[PDB]
Amino acid sequence: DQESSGFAWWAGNARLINLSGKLLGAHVAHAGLIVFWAGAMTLFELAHFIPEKPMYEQGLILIPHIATLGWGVGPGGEVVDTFPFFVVGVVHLISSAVLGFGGVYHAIRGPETLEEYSSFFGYDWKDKNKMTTILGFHLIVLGIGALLLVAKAMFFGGLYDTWAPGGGDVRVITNPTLDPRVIFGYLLKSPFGGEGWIVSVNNLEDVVGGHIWIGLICIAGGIWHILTTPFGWARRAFIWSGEAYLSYSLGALSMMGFIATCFVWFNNTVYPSEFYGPTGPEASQAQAMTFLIRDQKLGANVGSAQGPTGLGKYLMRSPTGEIIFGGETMRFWDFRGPWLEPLRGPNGLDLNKIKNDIQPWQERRAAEYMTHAPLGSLNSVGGVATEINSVNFVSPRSWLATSHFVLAFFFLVGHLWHAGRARAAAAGFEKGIDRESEPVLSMPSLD
Amino acid sequence: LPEAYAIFDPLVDVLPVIPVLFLALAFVWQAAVGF
Amino acid sequence: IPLWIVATVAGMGVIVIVGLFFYGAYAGLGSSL
Amino acid sequence: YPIFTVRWVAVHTLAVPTIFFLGAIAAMQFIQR
Amino acid sequence: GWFDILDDWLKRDRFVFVGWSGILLFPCAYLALGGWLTGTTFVTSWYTHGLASSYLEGCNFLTVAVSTPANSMGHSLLLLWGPEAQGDFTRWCQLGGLWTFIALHGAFGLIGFMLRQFEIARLVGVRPYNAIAFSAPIAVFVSVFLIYPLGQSSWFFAPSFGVAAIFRFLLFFQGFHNWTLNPFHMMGVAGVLGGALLCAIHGATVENTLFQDGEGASTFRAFNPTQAEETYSMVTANRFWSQIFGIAFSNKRWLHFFMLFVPVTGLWMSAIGVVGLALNLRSYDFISQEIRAAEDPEFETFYTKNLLLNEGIRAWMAPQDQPHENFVFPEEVLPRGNAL
Amino acid sequence: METLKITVYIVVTFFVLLFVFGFLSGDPARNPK
Amino acid sequence: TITPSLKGFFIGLLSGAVVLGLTFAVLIAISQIDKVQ
Amino acid sequence: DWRVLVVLLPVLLAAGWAVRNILPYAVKQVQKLLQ
Amino acid sequence: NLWERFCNWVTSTDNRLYVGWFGVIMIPTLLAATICFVIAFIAAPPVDIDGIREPVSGSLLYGNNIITGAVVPSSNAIGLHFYPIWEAASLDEWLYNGGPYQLIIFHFLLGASCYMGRQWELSYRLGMRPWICVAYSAPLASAFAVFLIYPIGQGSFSDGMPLGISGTFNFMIVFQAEHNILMHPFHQLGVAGVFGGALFCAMHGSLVTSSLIRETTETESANYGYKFGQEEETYNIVAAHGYFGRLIFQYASFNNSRSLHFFLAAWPVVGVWFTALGISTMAFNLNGFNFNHSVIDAKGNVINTWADIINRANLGMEVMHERNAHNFPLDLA
Amino acid sequence: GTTGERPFSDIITSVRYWVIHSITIPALFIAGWLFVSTGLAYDVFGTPRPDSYYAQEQRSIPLVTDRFEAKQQVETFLEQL
Ligand code: CLA
Ligand code: CLA
Ligand code: CLA
Ligand code: CLA
Ligand code: CLA
Ligand SMILES: CCCCCCCCCCCCCCCC(=O)OC[C@H](COP(=O)(O)OC[C@@H](O)CO)OC(=O)CCCCCCCCCCCCCCC
Ligand SMILES: CC1=C(/C=C/C(C)=C/C=C/C(C)=C/C=C/C=C(C)/C=C/C=C(C)/C=C/C2=C(C)CCCC2(C)C)C(C)(C)CCC1
Ligand SMILES: CC1=C(/C=C/C(C)=C/C=C/C(C)=C/C=C/C=C(C)/C=C/C=C(C)/C=C/C2=C(C)CCCC2(C)C)C(C)(C)CCC1
Ligand SMILES: CC1=C(/C=C/C(C)=C/C=C/C(C)=C/C=C/C=C(C)/C=C/C=C(C)/C=C/C2=C(C)CCCC2(C)C)C(C)(C)CCC1
Ligand SMILES: [Cl-]
């Protein structure tokens, strides 16, 4: 009841702030929901999956994650056996029942507080030692999880690699990149065009390598936070309360969600186009390729063909000179993909390779990706807005990019919400202004 | 789904919505306690 | 009759009927098919 | 309490046709061209 | 006396107040709302527009409309007993009679509602500024649904009552009147958006300058409607906005009047400009720009680009949006850039 | 050009360092109660 | 003479006069039964 | 035609059924009014 | 200490304008964006926004009035690449390709983000509750949507909203041609947010002005009945609620001022949040509802609705936007 | 204060209400259904059925051209079906 805590029913989970047993319960109960959805969604996707269709023509976002990890697929992304998808769903689903059972138990049946039950699980938010210790344990868990990805790539079948010679395939990662100048060079590239920050990672070696690195970084920091207490400069620079830590993570979860958006929109390495459909830049570049191949077959000389604007119709230069695809796709010349890189010489697209070396599988790939561009209506009509009904399709990339920008934006709002409140609760005016000691009434007047 | 489990493929169509219902139940419950 | 029961069943009636309208949007008149 | 009032009339001129209309709109989902 | 007896009953304190204004308001409002609901569910637009527009035909909530009567009806009142329907309910529906029915009963409903605000204000003891402010909705409705089509060839070019139909209206007004360029609409934008701003910012300011009058962390309980003290701090809210923005309100009465003034003023300005568009008296062009562009083919602004878009709208939508014109544009006259 | 790039890089560094070091110099304590 | 539209005009006139009549008839009656104190 | 009576039938039944469940409680209301 | 004096003045509550640490970024970035905007609006030369060597004039001195003038977005040849002054061979090349646009929008987004933080900050220094900045997040997100987020998803700052009155309308029109944003429920909620906010703003102002308590004569303004900082409320909430509850019915009215003012904040902010999100998700080409040819007759003839009339208009914008820039038949950029 | 009618809470809670309304709400709902399932809604309002928008060989839309003989023009359209 609201008279006991201060918080109303719509803010009822704030009554959990200093009840560690119930708070543990809700948390473990929530984690079951995530794992539940993961397993449930997978089985739904598998019950609706058709192997003869590409995954991206079928509204699948999880099976693509599983196949990128190397389970279920063969060369060029073709699904060869669906039993590994089945396992991933069943196991998550079965586990969620466990997470649910404990979560509900701690919520309504276990002891409401832990601090009198055990001195190890109990915690006071203002206790900077115990908090860094819990942080340390979880950092250790995160490090292990990042190493499980390494282990799957190096010791347990490998990963799907769209860049693999002969066409993408599952491949075991023998030489992860450990060179800090490469791994942390990604963390220092520009976010802007032609650079890409971490989103530009375009080889499994660099992926596997970076995970070895944060895997080690995390475990070390975990050990470091278990053994130390926060220094004095950190003590006076932060707010030490449950809501304060919740806000710090909302900001982080927000930053991560934006980054996830850009990753699935631009990157076709850890999001294989074989599974997720082409990217935006890719499908546009694929369109230009398709018409280059068609017109050249008719007898056009695509290097010297001038276009209406005077620029080249099929081929122009970039601002740094590189031979790129022409037309409005000029904006997409930073695109890189395995169907197009064979035509790339050192100066950009090689006119001789365009004339003599285009292979049927490339023409097929360009046409497929041109007519599967991530463009569609909310009710999944495929194409520009002016398209008539016929094609039921929205790219998984659109679906994943749009949702996680929404989640990211709202979690940034969440950060601003709980941050300011944490600051006001600690200072003692989160409930409003004391009439008998109004601060402004004691400051001097601006004029 | 493997055919030995084809009997549940109606049940699979519903499962992913179960987490949403959990959100709704918290309102049934607060309605039952009069908020 | 407890109101919380009336609240849940009415909404449940609402959710069903809305779901039937969205359902029809993919079949029969106005389905594009 | 009285049973029929100005309110009574007001709720029934909105509500009676609403349920009637929802019924008609319900059946429309099963019209095939 | 019977008049004072009927006044006693109309002005009774009930759940839904009636009043003298109720004799006009309720039947007209109920009939406007009932007519819209009736038509969007059952009534076509196949003979007026060539359009489907009912739930019964396949439309969803975004595409149902009570559509306007065909251009050939002119400004006919389209009464049920009038000369076009001649008392046939079926034909009246097929001819667009629900459109005028709704617009006219709606117009009179709005009169009844504004009279209602007057009637209740006088009985309760308050000044009548709420009814004054409702002038702006009435001015908007009158200019867009009555004056604008009265200026044009027929009720056909009024807005049809529907969600997507309203969107088409918006798009017609860009392609044909270049309505975005009209400074009277610009003043409306600034009063609508500036009203949203004042609504958001005044609500936040009060909620974030509250005094602490309870001990609960949900701060709503700490207000009693019968209390005498302000519930938030005008002094503190003033210093904050003084130091953040430069200027701050210091007078609560002027602040609330200003919240009336801004969006009311802006809707009235957009009505004025719609009155101009009734006569095709548009802000369509700037003569100086057209003289330069006709003599200098390298001159290109965003103004000249918008006109290319307006010309594309007009040629591509007119054959089906104005079907009484029997327009037939062979492909080669359609304006279009390369490729598309 | 390069002189400008270096000039702006120094300017930006300067203000960014004012920001981090200002918000570390004991911000929570700067409040009225 | 009385054209079809002029006949319609009276149709509408009497309809409206009937509607407002039944309206005010019923409203006066209710007001007489359920008076105030 | 026959369709009209098909449609009005439930409403007539419903109205009559409601009339019968409310009738003792209404005639007391009117009786209370006549004062 | 000298650094402590500086910090004491940065954070002072006695400054006519509050500076603060957020302000140490805000002031220079806004001043830079403002000065460059003023200069480019008046004086910039034509900019080749569509990267097809067809430059678009936007400044006053080049034949624009207040209505047609814009700072033109940077070239499509640039795309999402960063393009400060030093990346250009000369000021002349920078102006031709749209440099001032990036300079302005990036400084502005940084400056307005810190404006939001400044709002939390002074509120904390004053003993206030902290959420005014959460409300300001709704227009800030909207600005982020049209200057930054929508260029990212489309792949070029050249699809950013021009800094100009007509340029803005060119943005709305091309957007509707490409994404059908009128048929998108997130823009509809934005309409419901600004219309509703206008309505409620109008309502609250008329209701409070209506309930003002007589304190003045007729030969003076009713406003002089309120004095800055009186403890008595200046209007009668009970009378105002008495009125408005009778206008509709009593339970549809607010008798709690805090509950009413919270509603005043939440309705426009949420709706603007969603419309920011609508621009931000149409950036990734998740478009408004498409009902084109949705209704069909028994033979198979198309039976148009109003959606199909919206499409004919969308088509006419489509084939005329960027009239020389397309060499291939699908609009994928 | 309270105006005088019976609270809606006590009404949708009371047993008498749901005795009455578990019949009436379904009756109207079934009534609405039958209004469409019998095809009555088509003829009352004149809305074409999926086979009554054109004749078997026609793509011209039956648009009303004349104001005063319009009632007859619509009926000359329905006959050509
Ligand atoms: C993810 C959602 C989530 C979770 C995990 C929790 C969890 C919790 N809430 Mg919160 N809450 C939520 C959403 C959530 N809430 C929402 C959305 C609202 C708004 C309506 C609230 C409003 C709210 C209020 C107002 C309060 C709480 C409180 C609580 C705590 C005690 C609840 C209680 O007494 O239940 C009692 C209810 C029951 C005993 C009924 C049964 C409930 C269980 C969980 C059903 C489980 C079903 C499941 C299928 C069983 C699995 C079995 C297993 C073998 C697999 C608990 C830790 C309370 C608190 O803080 O107390 C100090 C409190 O006052 N919540
Ligand atoms: C990030 C999450 C995410 C993403 C990217 C997808 C993406 C997809 N899902 Mg999946 N799904 C999700 C979550 C997600 N889903 C969840 C949580 C559930 C449980 C209900 C499901 C259940 C589910 C099913 C059962 C199916 C899909 C399917 C699909 C596809 C079609 C989506 C569609 O048409 O939606 C329609 C679009 C909407 C319903 C719009 C919703 C808009 C939301 C409500 C806005 C919310 C805004 C904000 C959060 C609200 C708070 C604001 C407040 C704080 C102010 C698509 C590939 C379908 C498919 O093709 O499968 C093969 C399918 O059948 N999903
Ligand atoms: C984060 C999860 C979490 C946490 C912090 C706690 C904490 C606690 N639980 Mg709870 N519990 C949990 C999950 C959790 N539980 C789950 C999931 C279940 C359902 C299976 C239960 C079921 C449960 C019961 C039935 C009881 C408790 C009790 C306790 C208390 C005593 C535990 C003890 O001494 O363990 C000592 C340590 C061990 C027994 C060894 C644990 C070895 C683990 C499981 C190995 C696997 C680790 C691996 C990382 C897990 C991966 C999970 C996956 C989802 C990623 C303590 C306060 C007791 C209590 O409070 O009684 C009053 C009690 O009776 N818990
Ligand atoms: C989940 C991860 C996590 C969390 C929450 C914490 C939390 C904490 N750590 Mg720990 N730590 C972690 C992981 C984490 N650490 C790991 C994995 C390591 C091993 C490398 C360390 C190593 C470490 C050390 C060595 C120290 C801490 C300390 C701290 C405390 C102060 C942090 C601080 O001031 O940050 C604020 C960050 C700054 C002031 C840095 C300056 C500003 C930077 C440059 C901003 C850049 C952001 C920008 C957007 C760019 C991002 C992308 C890219 C370019 C980098 C705090 C309790 C301190 C303490 O008191 O320990 C006892 C301390 O000295 N941590
Ligand atoms: C930033 C974008 C923006 C903004 C803020 C506006 C703002 C405005 N536009 Mg503009 N407009 C825009 C962009 C924008 N427009 C663009 C890009 C175009 C294309 C060129 C248009 C095209 C356009 C047109 C065509 C019109 C406007 C009009 C308006 C005004 C409408 C005001 C209003 O509330 O009417 C709403 C209507 C009313 C308030 C009338 C009264 C309604 C009553 C009170 C309703 C009662 C309902 C009842 C209770 C029952 C309902 C039940 C039902 C829901 C079930 C307003 C000033 C209108 C105008 O200027 O009118 C004078 C107009 O006709 N705009
Ligand atoms: C809990 C769900 C939150 C949803 C998003 C946030 C909604 C409100 C955000 C408005 C911020 C306005 C600026 C400052 C506004 C401001 O200052 O607020 C002040 C006001 C009162 O604050 P208190 O200090 O009393 O309470 C906040 C905490 O202190 C808890 O006590 O805050 C609230 O009441 C929050 C209500 C939470 C419940 C919100 C649910 C409403 C949304 C429901 C879903 C709508 C979906 C629509 C779909 C189309
Ligand atoms: C705290 C709380 C809460 C929450 C709760 C929760 C969140 C819970 C969770 C729970 C959970 C989370 C649960 C789970 C469960 C699961 C399960 C129960 C499962 C089972 C499964 C199975 C049995 C499987 C089967 C199968 C197989 C084996 C194969 C395939 C097919 C099938 C599917 C048949 C709420 C909000 C209400 C409020 C109150 C308080
Ligand atoms: C895995 C991987 C990778 C890698 C990754 C990495 C290596 C990462 C790292 C990362 C990192 C290394 C991160 C970090 C971050 C940081 C941050 C995020 C920060 C934050 C900060 C803050 C938040 C602060 C704040 C403040 C200020 C500003 C002042 C004073 C106050 C305060 C404290 C509040 C790669 C890409 C190779 C590839 C792929 C895979
Ligand atoms: C015309 C006319 C008339 C009138 C009639 C009337 C007056 C009618 C009424 C009618 C009505 C009165 C109807 C109603 C309807 C209703 C409806 C049809 C509804 C529906 C609803 C829904 C569907 C819901 C939805 C929703 C919402 C909105 C909220 C939440 C969400 C949801 C989705 C649940 C007369 C004969 C005198 C004369 C001649 C002409
Ligand atoms: Cl254009």
Ligand SMILES: [Cl-]
């Ligand atoms: Cl092109």
Ligand SMILES: [Fe+3]
């Ligand atoms: Fe106020």
